[PDB]
Amino acid sequence: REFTIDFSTQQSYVSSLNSIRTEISTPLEHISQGTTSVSVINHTPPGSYFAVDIRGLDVYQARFDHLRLIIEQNNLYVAGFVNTATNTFYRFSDFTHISVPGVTTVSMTTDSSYTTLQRVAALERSGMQISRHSLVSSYLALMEFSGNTMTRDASRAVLRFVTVTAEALRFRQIQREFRQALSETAPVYTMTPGDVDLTLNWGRISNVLPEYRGEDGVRVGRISFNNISAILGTVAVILNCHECQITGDRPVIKINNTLWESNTAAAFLNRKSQFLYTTGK
Amino acid sequence: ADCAKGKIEFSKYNEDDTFTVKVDGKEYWTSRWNLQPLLQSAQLTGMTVTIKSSTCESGSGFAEVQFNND
Amino acid sequence: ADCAKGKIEFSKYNEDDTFTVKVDGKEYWTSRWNLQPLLQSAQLTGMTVTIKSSTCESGSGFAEVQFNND
Amino acid sequence: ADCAKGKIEFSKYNEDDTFTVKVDGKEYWTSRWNLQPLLQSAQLTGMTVTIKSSTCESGSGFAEVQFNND
Amino acid sequence: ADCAKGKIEFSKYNEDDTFTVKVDGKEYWTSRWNLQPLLQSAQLTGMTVTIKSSTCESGSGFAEVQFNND
Amino acid sequence: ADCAKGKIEFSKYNEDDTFTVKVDGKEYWTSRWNLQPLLQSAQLTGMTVTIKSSTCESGSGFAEVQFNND
Amino acid sequence: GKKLLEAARAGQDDEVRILMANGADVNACDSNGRTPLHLAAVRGHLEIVEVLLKNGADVNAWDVIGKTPLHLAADGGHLEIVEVLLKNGADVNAWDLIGRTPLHLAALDGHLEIVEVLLEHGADVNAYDRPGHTPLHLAARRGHLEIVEVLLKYGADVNAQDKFGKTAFDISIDNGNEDLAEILQ
Ligand code: NA
Ligand code: NA
Ligand code: NA
Ligand code: NA
Ligand code: NA
C-alpha cells in the first residue's frame, strides 16, 4: 500500500496520519473514543511495508515530491527511502528483508537505528529541531544523497523524517507537537526528552496498553498516563504484542488501581535491605 | 505450620527495626531485614504470602514465608 | 501516635543519610536506612503511609510507618 | 549443571535465611543473600531463570542462577 | 541549593566508586551507595529528581536529592 | 574502553558472588556488589547499558557501567 | 505434626483436643523448630496454651533461632499468655542466639503491659544483647516513649553504651524521635 503524508497544513498532516492508522491498525476496545484510539497494528508478515509519499513540504504545491519512505508495517520502522526521480530505494542494512519491486535497491552499510543515525548525523534527537524549512532541507539532502553509506546530512534528514512520520504515527503526542511547525507562523518543533522517551518505550507501552481496563493510571517505565485522555493524547498506534517483551512474560501488575508494566515494578522491588546493601561493599 | 495465607493487608516498619505484616486478619512481625523488601514487594504486587512458623498467634514472630504470584 | 496519613508527596535523601518524606503536608525524616527504598517504592506506587511517632511536629523524626494499599 | 530452567513457581524465605525457589517443579535453596530480591523480582515478572548446581534434585542448594529473557 | 531538577538522563557507576547521574543537562555524582538504588529507581520510573547541594558546580558530588513522581 | 553497549541479554549470579551480564554478545562480570540490583533492573527494563573496562573480551571483568534510557 | 500446629495457630481448641486424642505429638516441630506452643503463644490463644501445657508440651522449647514461647508471646504483646507461661515455669531471661531476652522483644515492639509483667517476674532490666544493646536502647530506637518511661522508672541504665559507644540518647537522635530524646535528656 502507498499513502501520502501531506505536510501542507496541520489538517492535511493529521488527516494523512489518521488515514494511515485506520488502514494499518485496529482500535483497542478499551482505549477508543469516537474514531480516536490507541490502535494495534494489524498483523502482517514480516517484510510487509507500506510506502509513504512525502508531499506538501511547500504548502499545497507539487514540488519537493520525489521522496517516499518505505515503512515496515509491523513495527513502523523506516526501512529506507526512495528517490522517485531516480527510482532508487536506499535501504538500511537491517532491512534486507524488505524488497521494493520496480526500483533499484541500494543496500546501505548504515543500519536504521537511532543510535547509528544520531551518530552519523552528529545530531541528538533530544532537542532536535524540525520545522517546515528543515524538512525541505532534509528532503533536499535525501534527494542529493547517493551512495551505500549514509552521510551526516542524509542521517539528519532521516532523523527528522522518521520523527514526523513513523513516530507521529505511533504517538499522537508527537503528531500534536510537531504539527504546530506546519502552521502559517512556521514555528520550530523541538523534540523534547519526553518525546524521545516515548519513542524509546514504544514496545513496552505496546505490551501494556492492551491490558488496560480503565485503571486510574498506567505506568510504563518513565512513562505515566493518569487517565484515558492522557493515553489518547499521547499514543496512537502500538505494536501488535499478540519488541513487546523484554524479559519475563507478565505484561502488567495492577497496583493501587494503576496498571504497571510488571518489569518496571520488578525493577524497583528487587532491592535488598538498604542497610545491608550499603554496608556490603 | 502455615500461620496465615493471603494478601498482605498492611505492612509496617517498626521502631525496633522489625517489620509487621497483617495477613488474613492476623499480624505477624519478623526481625529479618531482608524480608522487609520481600514483604513489601509481595504486598505491592498482590502476592499471596504464606507466613510459616513454629507458633502462629497474632503478634507472633516469623522468619519463613512463601510467596506466590497467586 | 499517627502523625500523618496519606500518600508521599515527595521524599528526599539528606546529606546526613537520613530520609525525609512529606505526608499530608508534614515532613518527617528517618535515620533508618532500611526505610529509604521502602518509602520510595511506597511513593512510586501511591501507597498510603501512616507516619507513626511519639512526636508529630512537622520536621521531626520517625522510625515507624505503616504501608497500606488502596 | 543446569538443573532447572523456567519460571519461579513460588519462592520462600526460610528460617535459616536461605531462600527457596521452585523451578520446573523442583525446589532449590540458596544462601546467597543477594539472590533473594533478585529471584523475587524475577518471579514477579515471570522471568525465566536457570538454576545451576552440582545436584539437581528438588531440595538441592544453588549459588548460581542465570536470569534469562525467554 | 537546588542544582538541577528533572528526570535522570543517564546514570553511571564509575570505577572510582562514584555514581553519576545527569539531570537537566548537568552531571553530578554521589558516592552514597544508599542513593544508587534510589536514583536508578527514580531513573527507570521517570521520577523528577532535584539534586541539592551547597555545591552546585557541574561534576561535583551531592548527597541531597528530592524525589517526586511528577 | 567501551566494551559493549546494548541491552542485557542475560544476567547471572556466579558462584564466586560476582555477577555477569551478557551485552552485545559478550559476557562481563563484576564483583561490585552495588551493581547487582542495578544491572538486574536494567535487564528488566531493557536499559541500554555501556560496559566499560580495560579489556573487552568476553569473560572480562568490569567495575564501570552506564545505564541509559534507550 | 503439621495438623496440631495449624490447629494451634488457628486457636481451634476442639481440633487441638481431637488431634491430641488421636495421638498427635504435643511437642511436634515444623521446619525451623516451631512447636504448637510457639504458634499458640504468638497468636495469644490462652485456652490452647493451657490445654497444650496440661498435655505436657515443653514450655521452654526453642526454635532454630533460640526463640521460646515466652519470647513469641512477648513479641506479640500477649500479657495473659506471658503470665501463664511464667506460671508454668518458662524462663523469663531465656536469651536467643543473638542474646535477645523477652524484655528486649517487648521493648522493641512497644508493649508496656508485658514489659511491666516481665520486670515484675525478674527480667534483667539492663540485659545486654550481643552488640551491647539494652532494652532502653531498643525502646529509644523504635520511639516507644511509654516503654522508655516504664524503663527509666525501674532503674534502667541511661548511660549504657552499645558496641559503637552509642547511648540510648544517641540512638533516639539517630531515629529522629525528639520526644524520646526529651524524655531521656
Ligand atoms: Na485522512
Ligand atoms: Na483499521
Ligand atoms: Na512484562
Ligand atoms: Na511465630
Ligand atoms: Na517524630
Author numbering:
A (entry chain A): 1 to 242, 259 to 297
B (entry chain B), C (entry chain F), D (entry chain C), E (entry chain E), F (entry chain D): 1 to 70
G (entry chain G): 1 to 185
From the paper:
Shiga toxins belong to the AB5 family of protein toxins and are comprised of an enzymatically active A subunit and a non-toxic pentameric B subunit. Interaction between the B subunit and the carbohydrate moiety of the glycosphingolipid Gb3 on the extracellular leaflet of cell plasma membranes enables these toxins to enter host cells through receptor-mediated endocytosis and to be retrogradely transported from the Golgi apparatus to the endoplasmic reticulum (ER). The pathology of STEC infection is primarily caused by the action of two exotoxins—Shiga toxin 1 (Stx1) and Shiga toxin 2 (Stx2)—which attack the ribosomes and trigger apoptosis upon their uptake by the host cells.
We report the engineering of a panel of designed ankyrin repeat proteins (DARPin) with potent neutralization activity against Stx2a, the major subtype associated with HUS. DARPin is a small (18 kDa) scaffold protein which has been engineered to bind diverse targets, and it enjoys a low immunogenicity potential, a very high expression yield in microorganisms (15 g per liter of E. coli culture in fermenters, or 23% of dried cell weight), high solubility, and long shelf life. Employing a protein engineering approach combining both directed evolution and rational design, we created a dimeric DARPin SD5 with potent neutralization activity against Stx2a (EC50 0.6 nM). SD5 is composed of two DARPins—SHT, which targets the toxin A subunit and neutralizes the toxin catalytic activity, and #3, which binds the B subunit and induces a novel conformational change in the B subunit that distorts the five-fold symmetry and interferes with toxin attachment. The two monomeric DARPin constituents of SD5 exhibit complementary functions—SHT targets the enzymatic A subunit of Stx2a and inhibits the toxin’s catalytic activity, while DARPin #3 binds the B subunit, based on the cryo-EM study, and induces a novel conformational change in the B subunit that distorts its five-fold symmetry and presumably interferes with toxin attachment to target cells. Finally, the unprecedented toxin conformational change induced by DARPin #3 represents a novel mode of action for neutralizing Stx2 toxicity and reveals new targets for future drug development.
